[PDB]
Amino acid sequence: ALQTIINARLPGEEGLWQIHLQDGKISAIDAQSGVMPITENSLDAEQGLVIPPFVEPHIHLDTTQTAGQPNWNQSGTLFEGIERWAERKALLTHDDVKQRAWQTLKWQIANGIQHVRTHVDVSDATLTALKAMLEVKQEVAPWIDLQIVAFPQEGILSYPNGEALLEEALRLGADVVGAIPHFEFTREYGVESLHKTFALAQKYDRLIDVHCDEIDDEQSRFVETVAALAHHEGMGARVTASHTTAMHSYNGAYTSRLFRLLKMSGINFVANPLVNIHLQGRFDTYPKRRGITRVKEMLESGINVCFGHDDVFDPWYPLGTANMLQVLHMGLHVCQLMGYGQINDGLNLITHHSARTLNLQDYGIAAGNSANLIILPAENGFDALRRQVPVRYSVRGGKVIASTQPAQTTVYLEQPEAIDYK
Ligand SMILES: C[C@H](O)COCC(COC[C@@H](C)O)(COC[C@@H](C)O)COC[C@@H](C)O
Ligand SMILES: Nc1nc(=O)[nH]c2nc[nH]c12
Ligand SMILES: [Zn+2]
Ligand SMILES: [Zn+2]
Structure with a gap:
């Protein structure tokens, strides 16, 4: 011993x-x-x-290690990533998913990561990947505590039977409910999808984690609904908004108004630097925006924010070794958190703040x-x-x-x- x-x-x-x-x-x-x-x-x-x-609060273990199959993300956009994935999602098998998820999981253990939250696409009548990933959770438990988000990659109201499929995924045992309101067909769908998501989370006593405003659109404001719903339900700590890259392009007056609510609601934020820098700014020419959510201002206001890796070697992101210090490194640079104090505290962004996000005790x-x-x-x-x-x-x-x-x-x-x- x-x-x-x-x-x-x-x-x-x-x-x-x-x-x-x-x-x-x-x-x-x-x-x-x-x-x-x-x-x-x-x-x-x-x-x-x-x-x-180390904690990894945002990763997609069902897509991991599939880069270049069947085709490549030529444009390198968040929208073509989703087109390429849907091609490769047609060829998913139970064994394939477990094989790839285990590989990345092994890299993660090697890198000191004992807590992981993985989003799994549940826009699939068969739920192949979700069911397989529920097994991986039990298999890997001795080394990592894995949380599984039922992630409606193609929308809740925009996908045939998406609401039903999301619910079944919770019945089966997904720890967290996901959503993706900015991808829904309309603004109204986006907003309502968040009412549904929240009703599901309350019905099953589960956490929430939204892909929230991952888009360079200053009108994409779904984060305010996430925060308002959480506050209304008193469930702040159980709620996470991922990406919120649209916030990088908000006008300052609105952002200041919004921050009051974010601080009251107590929800959590994940930024994903490695991927954000690669996929945001793709519709700019020059100059070209950075595209990370407002990390620096969140830290100053005492709003809990942390860093995920998001994608390891797949359509959306061709690199990675699941290394959190590398993620932190890109984050400090891109967010301009480059003072000595700031860099030294940077560890909290991959340790304590992430644990708060996953709701660990x-x-x-x-x-x-x-x-x-x-x-x-x-x-x-x-x-x-x-x-x-x-x-x-x-x-x-x-x-x-x-x-x-x-x-x-x-x-x-x-x-x-x-x-x-x-
Ligand atoms: C991907 C590769 O590097 C590891 O594959 C072996 C592994 C075998 O299944 C484990 C289970 C408890 O029976 C997990 O290995 C970890 C051990 C050493 O704890 C996963 O392989 C997936 C198959 C079963 O489709
Ligand atoms: N960055 C990403 N955005 C998505 O909408 N889906 C994904 N699946 C893996 N990575 C991503
Ligand atoms: Zn099985
Ligand atoms: Zn994601």
Whole structure:
């Protein structure tokens, strides 16, 4: 067994620390007088940083790893992604889905991610991918806690039987209800689709997560309905609005009006930098807008926002290794969160704020919580973000589920020298 972690730094804390493990929980965290000797049963942090595991609050595991089949997203738009997907969605099998989802899931474990929320397209009479993904959830449970969103990719009112299909998906056991109002045929459909979604969530006691205004249209304002419904139902914390990239193009007077409500409703926001930068601004020429939602202003106002990866190697996004520090990296740049303080706090955007978004209770390095945690070979958030460090150890329920032996770089000058980039 493991009974202690030694020589660990904690975010915003002086010196080193020792973390006591008992029965898959954290029993105690005590300061150190300094470096301790490596004992058996203890895991050596080696003065690395200890934080709770990375969260991925937005990913599509049913589409993952399918890039270039049958065809490519030539235009690289959010709308042609959906055309390409519908072609490939016709060739989905139970085995195919599980095979691909497991691959990405493995990368995620390797990268210190122990919590994941995956959207699954339920605009399909057969519900192949949703049913397969409900199994993957149970299969992967020992390493990752997977939440499944029933995601009506082709609309609730705009797809034949979409409302029925969404409901069946909840009956079967999807944890979260999704919607996509800006894709519905009309504005009125969009608005009503959100009443339905909310009624479903209340009927089944489930969370909500909308693809909300993912479009460079300053008239796409469905987020206000999401926030208003949540507030009316008192269900704030259970509600997430994903993307809201339209907000990047709102006029400032409306945005300021809107923010009052967003703060009162207590809903959550996910931005997806890697994908947003790639797919937004595609209808601009020059100049060309960035297209990420208003992260910086949300942080200032204390509105919970976090970062997802959204797509790993599929029609919508041809790259990725499910790496959250890489996502955070693109986010700080594009959102211009480049002060020292801002970059160092950036970890919260892939840890604590994401956990708040998934509505987790058992989360954080504190006594009484499960021994779920990761160790980074780095001094602080800034250092880890700057050097794009891998995850040294991933500990789940008191057991090491993954470990990375760091790369080693040598330059041969007048004599050999180790390079660490510090
Ligand atoms: C995609 C690849 O890298 C992994 O595939 C093996 C895997 C086998 O099924 C697991 C289940 C508990 O019986 C999962 O492997 C993880 C183990 C080592 O815990 C998933 O393969 C999908 C098939 C069954 O269509
Ligand atoms: N960015 C995306 N937008 C969508 O509407 N559907 C998707 N499915 C995977 N990625 C995406
Ligand atoms: Zn099966
Ligand atoms: Zn998505």
